[PDB]
Amino acid sequence: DAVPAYPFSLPHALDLDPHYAELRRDEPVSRVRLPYGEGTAWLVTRMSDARIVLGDSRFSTAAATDPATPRMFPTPPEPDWVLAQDPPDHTRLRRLVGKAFTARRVEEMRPRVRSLVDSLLDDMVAHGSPADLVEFLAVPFPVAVICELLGVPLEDRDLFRTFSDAMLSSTRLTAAEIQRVQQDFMVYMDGLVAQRRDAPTEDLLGALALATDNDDHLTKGEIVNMGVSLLIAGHETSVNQITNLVHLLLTERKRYESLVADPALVPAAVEEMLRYTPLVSAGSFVRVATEDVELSTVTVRAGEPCVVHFASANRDEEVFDHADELDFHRERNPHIAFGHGAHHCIGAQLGRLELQEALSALVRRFPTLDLAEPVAGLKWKQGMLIRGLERQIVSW
Ligand code: HEM
Ligand SMILES: CC[C@H]1OC(=O)[C@H](C)[C@@H](O)[C@H](C)[C@@H](O)[C@@H](C)C[C@@H](C)C(=O)[C@H](C)[C@@H](O)[C@H]1C
Ligand code: NA
Ligand code: NA
């Protein structure tokens, strides 16, 4: 009617729409119309407000399963989705699998992970320059890690990648196309979990099968969907972010040189590019206020929905100096690239390790790495809730 459409525009590369800085300065909480559901939502663009919306029991994701609630994606959320659970029910669900994702358990993975990266970078040198970093690194690396961690067969790669791409549709597919894929993925994962019934496994799917038979307070739907979410997230974030971080490094090649010179700066640079990159192209899973909640400039009423732009909150000038510049030497970096509060990313430590090991490996072994295709011709993924590159031809 009279509030603006969000997203504000079709995205360009990893650029933020200029309107977010305008809102952060002048209207940090504003009404928008999202592409699906009904009514309006408050768009939250500053770090302080984002930590309230993501971090407070007065903001409920369970309330977002109402199909009338505004949302960024065609299908209404279902009660069994991990994102649609509120504590304390959500806390019990994340304990099903949390143990595998602790910083300590992820750190135990670094040797296997580094070996996988090296092997895949040998396949790329064997092929010779120029080569498609998506084909040789960005896809096969995170897919192998999530397959080994869950106990999902590696030969199912093309099957679960086409499911995962459809479920991360923003505008690419219709609600019916995505609903059909959600059904297929649920039945496939329900299938993998069921193979552990008289044959237990030492992997996350084995942990999910024991929960199915022995745990009294988790529904089979919740458990199976958890397996779906881990398999989507565990490859889709890292696959895209390897392309995003390499894009940022090579298009202002000083950045890449800065890490060629001091490879020990890669962990800090991974944190800085996580802050700087809109992996989530726009918006967030929606939170609905269950009670009135005071944000910086407005009181959100019980029943009003809110949506956060993670990448805008990560450019807040009240939080980060020269927020609009990539700086691998900031003393402090309290970004929310992994979210905040209850739904804080379960895989945050695994995403960190994968980006650290892929980047460290390239910066060490490919000091001459360059983009071998025109910037203008880059195939950015269109019509998806996340951003990344379908292809990234590099030369060494
Ligand atoms: C660079 C890598 C990654 C980024 C930037 C990222 C970002 C995020 C963000 C922003 C959220 C919060 C969503 C919200 O609250 O609205 C989140 C949640 C989630 N992430 Fe990650 N993520 C990454 C890697 C991974 C990995 C490797 C996995 C799995 C192995 C994973 C699994 C999840 C899951 C299951 C959730 C939902 C958690 C819940 O609702 O309790 N992510 N991620
Ligand atoms: C509106 C944008 C968000 O998309 C959604 O909510 C999607 C419908 C999620 O259901 C997807 C399919 C799930 O698999 C997540 C577990 C993936 C995990 C990485 C995230 O939480 C991710 C940040 C996500 O919240 C955003 C892409
Ligand atoms: Na929340
Ligand atoms: Na955006």
Author numbering: 12 to 407
What does the paper say about this structure?
The 8.8a-oleandolide epoxygenase OleP, from Streptomyces antibioticus, is the P450 involved in the polyketide biosynthesis of the antibiotic oleandomycin. It introduces an epoxide function to the C8-C8a of the macrolactone ring of two structurally different intermediates, namely the aglycone 8.8a-oleandolide (DEO) and the C3-mono-glycosylated L-olivosyl-8.8a-deoxyoleandolide (L-O-DEO). Substrate binding to the cytochrome P450 OleP is coupled to a large open-to-closed transition that remodels the active site, minimizing its exposure to the external solvent. When the aglycone substrate binds, a small empty cavity is formed between the I and G helices, the BC loop, and the substrate itself, where solvent molecules accumulate mediating substrate-enzyme interactions.
As predicted, the substitution of G92 with a tryptophan and S240 with a tyrosine resulted in filling the solvent cavity, which is occupied by the bulky aromatic sidechains. This reduces to some extent the volume of the active site in both mutants, which is ~606.7 Å3 in the wild type and ~582.5 and ~566.8 Å3 in G92W and S240Y, respectively. In G92W and S240Y mutants, the bulkier and more hydrophobic groups are located in the cavity, causing, respectively, the partial and the total displacement of the solvent molecules and resulting in the formation of direct interactions between the enzyme and the substrate. In G92W, the tryptophan adopts a double conformation in conjunction with E89. In G92W, we identified: (i) A T-stacking interaction between W92 and F84 (BC loop) and F296 (β-hairpin β3); (ii) an induced dipole-dipole type interaction between the aromatic ring of W92 and the δ-carbonyl group of N236 and the ε-amino group of Q193. The G92W mutation is also able to alter the arrangement of the substrate with respect to the heme iron. The local analysis of the protein cavities as obtained by MD simulations show that in the G92W mutant the distance distribution maximum between the heme-iron and substrate is slightly higher than the WT and E89Y mutant. This might justify the uncomplete shift towards the high-spin state of the G92W mutant observed by means of UV-visible spectroscopy. Since the magnitude of the motions experienced by the BC loop (aa 83–100) in the open-to-closed transition is small (~3 Å), it is plausible that direct contacts of W92 with the substrate and the protein may be already formed in the open state.
